[PDB]
Design a protein around this ligand. Structure first.
Ligand SMILES: CC(=O)SCCNC(=O)CCNC(=O)[C@H](O)C(C)(C)COP(=O)(O)OP(=O)(O)OC[C@H]1O[C@@H](n2cnc3c(N)ncnc32)[C@H](O)[C@@H]1OP(=O)(O)O
Ligand SMILES: CC(=O)SCCNC(=O)CCNC(=O)[C@H](O)C(C)(C)COP(=O)(O)OP(=O)(O)OC[C@H]1O[C@@H](n2cnc3c(N)ncnc32)[C@H](O)[C@@H]1OP(=O)(O)O
Ligand SMILES: CC(=O)SCCNC(=O)CCNC(=O)[C@H](O)C(C)(C)COP(=O)(O)OP(=O)(O)OC[C@H]1O[C@@H](n2cnc3c(N)ncnc32)[C@H](O)[C@@H]1OP(=O)(O)O
Ligand SMILES: CC(=O)SCCNC(=O)CCNC(=O)[C@H](O)C(C)(C)COP(=O)(O)OP(=O)(O)OC[C@H]1O[C@@H](n2cnc3c(N)ncnc32)[C@H](O)[C@@H]1OP(=O)(O)O
Lengths: 396, 396, 396, 396
């Protein structure tokens, strides 16, 4: 009756239909490249309603091969789930759960240590062992009142057309994503897609003008309806001077009232200004989500805080076994075991901690991670913290 | 021309006038008590147009004796600036600056370690040495979709008339403030104020109600116009079990479409729900600001992370002296010095970093605090962190 | 523990709290009159948390002696549920279900053929055997353009002070409710209340005025905020001429832009105007709900369309026994039986038909009332219609 | 002075100017086809300013050949007026009255028993003998709270590209319109237009997708700006089951918050849900308007309610002559008479009653329909009713 499998040339039309209705943003021409370019052999799956070539496609999901920067500037190959969809005619038949379990096994066999996604909704993926792992705050600062603090660092920047500086953006982005927990390698095909979206579209987005610095850039587009608002689609800075030079320039768009940007909680913008309130937060939400596929691999992969002295504990993941984890001198040793578990937690929660965006003590407060040793809490809080604040790279 | 000095009895009326026209929330009857029983003798100063008694009151500013909890569960006597006002007629004449110079002087003399306030605007007090020290998050939660996580702790709480449980509120409050950095001793005169406010005002706010658990409580008043919005004026809890029980009951306001609360960034509410987002962040702003009056006094009083290995640096506060600072064992020694400064900052930067609500590394990136050692940045971040996350008490 | 009982004197306060925290419209002094003068001995019920006197009140519900005009102008004493509440701390533990079961046992033993309520939400009382039985249409008319048709009937009306003409209103309202299915007799305590609400409340509703006509009246008041909107709280007309006369005068309120009223689907107001669209439906929702307590009594009490030819059938009510139903000469005869059921439905469906507001054929398309014979659908459609279209009396 | 005549080939441009400047939705290319294809030679007329080829077009109006289904599954040839426009520079000189009189004579002279239109404004066509004959209810349903009742009927339907199933749709819509009062025959040239209007348009509507059942279908698209809102363009169902299963699917659009749709008052959606309120009515207005050209032909053409007993009366239509109307066994005999009229009414009232969308009892309360005999009034309500509730086909 219902089949779950890797597509063949026959399901393509099924997937194309399902994808278009399901994703408002999605279109056929732009989409064809992404999948060919970023999806491994059998990192894609479809649910067929029956059997026979041409059997209707009622579910799809696939993962891309991407490189994630975790704390300590390590890069972990990462499975990135995307284009997850069930047809509206088949809701609640276990199809999403089935598709994830299949994808997870393949990722596990492929030797990925983590998986990742951006959630359409907040309540879906926790059950499949994804915890939210970065935070995205919409930023809008009125530009009419902003003055830079006397301390702020800093003309060393140029207004340019984006299509004429792709190479510069690429270099800059590559340095940045290698330095920031959350960075993702952006392959040529996504520069293509990102680059094209700069050109104005009839009935859609306006032309986008870049701000270019040797160690940073910013792409910004005037809003479609509110002609007094500028939207920064992306800002990349490797140094604090470029970050501040770019902001002085954005603040400099005198024909604008407001500037808005998606950014991280540790963005220093507020502090560059005389009135930190001007860089107001207008939206707060989860960004990238992580699933730890291989506990030992994942915990040994990432660097830890040096500023916490050596300690040892047994961590138990609900129905993922037990682990002896040792962290000292910024490194971890994690191996399976059978000793009593000093601390226990669902798999999704471990993800939430993996990058440093969530403190273990808060989750503890919500009974999402348990233990009887208050001292161990503080140590994990400390250990798992990121020296460099986590940043979100691009949605996928 | 004009004249700065302590207010006599003849100056009262004039001040109330100035206050009512400066602060839309002011009231003549309600304040007389808080100002009178909480403002120390000669804690209040005014500026008069010319001389000869009863001169027109044009500037005013006073402070209150309050006890602030800081990291390590230590209470510091604190001076809380309030009813700072210059008349519309005398703006930008240095009255605010002069009134500040005067009170800081008195405050220094009188033996206060530091002075705190709440800021009407965002770019007034930094120059005077105040730095934003805690963060306010408005959470707006859609009650209808909320569902508690299986991990969530939890009937032990009863819907009560606030004026009937003063004692149990007060005791609960006392437990909370002695445990939460940012906690404030609540004066009896302020329990009066709060108890009185619960009553419905014709055309004003509606009656408040309370939810009472042995180890926590909540006051909530239905909003004046959105009859589908319950506003929580104050949520107080001392155990994870109370925090959750109270929320299980807030989500149980079935007639409400949403619940709103002013809380702190580390509030575990979101993690208690199967959907993290439902606890949407709506309004974000700075709350309690700190002016460190005595650097060694303050720095030595607060406890520090044990999970950071002992270390030594030389801190220079601009206009704040130079001290050799050493942290180890959760304690700090701070002693004058003329060695080269390894790290410098404006005085306000010290205050923001004092409760742990800001990371030294983020401020560094705005060049608000500067150093050439990166390992030290990390050490500060870790040292100044707070095992217990900072919470805000009550505006004043 | 959880005790379910008729409220004693010791409970009154417990209820005032539970009511005020449950219904924003609640007032203690005024509501005290209705339970006392309209609720039968043991027509009220409360749930107490535990044992001891003055235990806390965590659920409440009561039923007032309701007189109802059903089709045929027949008046049936009916139990009207009101002030149903379960505390937010005790929601989902079966208290509503428990309070209902009990009141129902009381209502049946007392002889009431049927029960009625107004539902706070739409998904509650179906499972208890109440169906939405009347429709409310909120009508907003932009009178700046309203012109009367040449056929519209019609200064035989007067502008009056409502509190000077209570008796005229009682007499008028008396004739009206005896004639219209949906009428309820309005007792003296309720007229006290209605008249009381006509006076201005500081920070509340403005003074109400009345339009008085020999065969009808309208009470209306200018809206609190929108000074160009008139709210008619009540319009009662015995004659088509009264209805038109009243609206002529309301369209005559030259200082208003809109007039709004809550009325029924067959209100002929639109057809009085040269442009039907001017009476725009700005709100539609279920109104009175009916639970048939005694199927034979209720069915025999109600009038039925004379035009439809006589006929017999056997109607089953889901777990409510089977029933021989004969309709002829606009009358019914209905007695328990054991014949095969020709038609069947959940008790609440019957409620929805009882007053002609919902077609048998419509309910059947949703499989809510089930029959193997089509002819019988159409016969039920014809029969249960009401010559006079059902209107809504007052909310309770 | 001015002239009224049939449009020659030289008037085509002027007509496109007038049409385009009087209708915001008008497009020259799409329209070309319907008028030539659907407008009969001579079914169109224009008014000119002056004489001499080239004169400017200041008035147009035409009719199309339509097939309307009326009670009894009977299909009347009908005349549909559309593209009625007087230039803003000639408003109020009688051009419409002049254009209507001419069209009506041609329409009668050609042997149509009934003309129909959609009214741009509600106070325009009544004077010309047209009366509102169907009702449109705009229903917005929040998808998230919707749960199907345990009784509801119902994977038997699938998500498809509309242009790949023209035949399946043509079939279904064909069975629909033959069964439902209000049905229209859809011309191949209009299926052309419907299919084309399904492709996305830059700055316009988004791609339409469809839901396809053996016995029904639904075309929907996500809204232009409201990305959480799904507009159903048209919904066709011939079985209750289809109607349900299609609604089971639209509710299955999880990415959406709201589905909206235009339908009729007797839509059973709400009764499919656990909460009838979820099927909120957000708009309600008259749809198809009818003018009975030929009283006997029309009254003898449509089937009547069987469940009313044979009866007789005298029906007098102002300006429409007098008739002995006799209804027996669901059929009507209507013949010329000079006997005393038992009931009188304007031509448009008869329009309104014709498809069963309005009750005579209600139009009588407006004194639009007049009789001294209430029993007679009940008999008309009963007889004119429809076994199948009337729905609206398409706007023309
Ligand atoms: C961009 C990315 O690819 S990530 C964003 C996801 N993409 C989309 O959501 C596209 C549109 N929406 C959909 O396609 C569907 O709603 C899907 C794919 C999310 C759901 O698939 P389904 O087959 O209906 O879910 P499935 O029944 O397999 O899941 C089972 C459980 O998940 C739950 N579930 C499914 N959707 C949701 C939801 N939106 N919120 C909470 N729980 C959910 C079910 O309640 C069920 O509960 P259970 O664990 O007790 O069994
Ligand atoms: C609850 C509490 O009491 S805290 C909130 C304070 N109360 C109020 O704001 C009441 C209404 N507003 C006011 O009373 C006035 O605006 C005050 C008291 C805040 C300002 O006093 P003033 O005398 O007008 O300012 P003054 O000239 O003395 O201050 C000097 C400096 O502060 C700066 N300053 C004063 N107000 C502001 C402001 N709103 N934003 C930024 N800078 C400001 C001046 O620009 C000036 O800058 P400078 O250092 O380069 O010279
Ligand atoms: C003016 C009047 O008095 S009439 C309007 C009703 N009064 C109110 O709503 C007052 C404010 N709200 C409340 O007091 C509560 O939410 C109540 C009284 C509606 C609910 O009572 P509760 O005791 O919490 O629910 P209870 O457990 O008794 O009900 C049982 C069933 O009804 C259902 N139910 C209760 N409330 C709702 C609701 N708002 N919507 C849908 N279903 C509901 C439950 O789902 C439960 O379902 P189940 O059969 O699967 O177990
Ligand atoms: C989709 C369709 O094709 S059907 C809908 C019609 N289309 C449009 O209306 C498009 C834009 N509007 C117009 O073109 C014009 O307003 C028209 C065509 C409706 C009116 O034509 P006119 O030539 O100005 O009116 P005309 O003088 O011929 O009609 C006479 C009477 O009708 C009345 N009338 C005309 N328009 C209206 C109106 N919008 N509302 C009420 N009455 C009107 C006049 O009052 C006039 O009064 P009277 O009965 O006392 O004599």
């Amino acid at each position: 009756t219902v089949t779950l499998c890797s597509p063949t040339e026959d399901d393509w039309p099924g997937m194309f239909l399902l994808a278009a209705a399901s994703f408002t943003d999605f279109i056929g021409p732009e989409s064809a490249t992404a999948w060919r370019t970023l999806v491994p052999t059998d990192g894609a799956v479809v649910v067929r309603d029956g059997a026979g070539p041409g059997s209707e496609v009622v579910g799809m999901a696939l993962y891309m091969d991407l490189r994630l920067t975790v704390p300590g500037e390590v890069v972990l190959p990462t499975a990135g789930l995307s284009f997850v969809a069930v047809a509206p005619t088949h809701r609640r038949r276990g199809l999403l759960r089935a598709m994830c379990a299949e994808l997870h096994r393949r990722i596990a066999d492929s030797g990925y240590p983590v998986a990742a996604l951006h959630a359409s909704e907040g309540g879906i993926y926790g059950r499949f062992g994804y915890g939210p792992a970065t935070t995205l705050h919409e930023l809008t600062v009125d530009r009419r009142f902003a003055r830079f603090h006397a301390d702020a660092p800093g003309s060393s920047v140029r207004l340019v057309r984006p299509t004429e500086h792709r190479g510069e953006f690429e270099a800059i982005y590559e340095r940045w994503r290698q330095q920031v927990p959350g960075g993702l390698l952006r392959p040529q095909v996504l520069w293509d897609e990102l680059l094209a979206e700069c050109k104005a579209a009839p009935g859609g987005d306006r032309e986008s003008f870049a701000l270019l610095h040797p160690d940073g850039y910013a792409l910004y587009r005037v809003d479609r309806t509110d002609l007094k608002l500028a939207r920064v689609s992306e800002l990349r800075a490797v140094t604090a001077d470029a970050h501040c030079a770019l902001w002085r320039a954005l603040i400099g768009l005198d024909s604008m009232e407001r500037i808005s940007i998606i950014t991280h909680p540790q963005d220093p913008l507020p502090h560059l200004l005389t009135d930190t309130r001007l860089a107001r937060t207008t939206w707060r939400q989860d960004g990238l989500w992580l699933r730890i596929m291989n506990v030992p691999a994942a915990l040994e992969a990432r660097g830890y805080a040096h500023e916490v002295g050596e300690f040892s504990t047994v961590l138990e993941v609900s129905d993922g076994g037990r682990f002896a984890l040792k962290i000292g001198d910024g490194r971890a040793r994690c191996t399976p075991t059978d000793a009593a578990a000093e601390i226990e937690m669902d798999r999704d929660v471990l993800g939430s901690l993996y990058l440093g965006a969530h403190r273990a003590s808060t989750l503890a407060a919500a009974n999402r991670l348990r233990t009887k040793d208050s001292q161990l809490l503080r140590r994990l809080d400390a250990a798992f913290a990121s020296d460099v604040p986590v940043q979100t790279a691009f949605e996928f």
